Design a binder for these strands. Structure first.
Length: 49
RNA sequence: CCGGCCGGGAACUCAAAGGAGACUGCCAGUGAUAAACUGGAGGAAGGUGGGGAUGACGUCAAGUCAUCAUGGCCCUUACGA
C-alpha cells in the first residue's frame, strides 16, 4: 500500500499530502515518486519484484 | 680440482624503452529514483592503493646589503692591502 510504488491514496492525493489538489496531475512528490492520478485506477495498478 | 671454470641458449631474474592496466567495471544492503560508505567475488595492486614534488589571494615591515648587486652614507698616508 504505497503511492510511490503504486499511486495516490485518493484522487490526485499525495501520500504525505503535499498535493491535496484535484488539479495536480503528473507532478510527483519529489521525496518519493507519487505521480498524481485517480486512485480508482489503483484497481489496475500493476507492479513487480 | 662443482669460487658456473670452458662451450652453448634467448623465455625468465635484471635493465633501457613503445604500451595494457585500477576508472568505483559488477552484485547487494543502507539511503530522498542522485552522490556516497561498508563487505565480497573478480584482480599483480582497491576503494585518489602508499610516498615525494606541486604550497591559492594573503599573515609575520620574519631572514640575507656575509654568494652578489644597489638610490645613497663613511673611509680614500685608511677601517684598503
Amino acid at each position: 500500500f504505497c503511492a510511490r510504488i503504486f499511486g495516490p491514496v485518493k484522487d490526485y492525493e499525495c501520500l504525505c499530502g503535499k498535493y491535496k489538489r484535484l488539479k495536480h496531475r503528473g507532478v510527483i512528490c519529489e521525496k518519493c515518486g507519487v505521480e498524481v492520478t485517480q486512485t480508482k485506477v489503483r484497481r489496475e495498478r500493476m507492479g513487480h519484484i
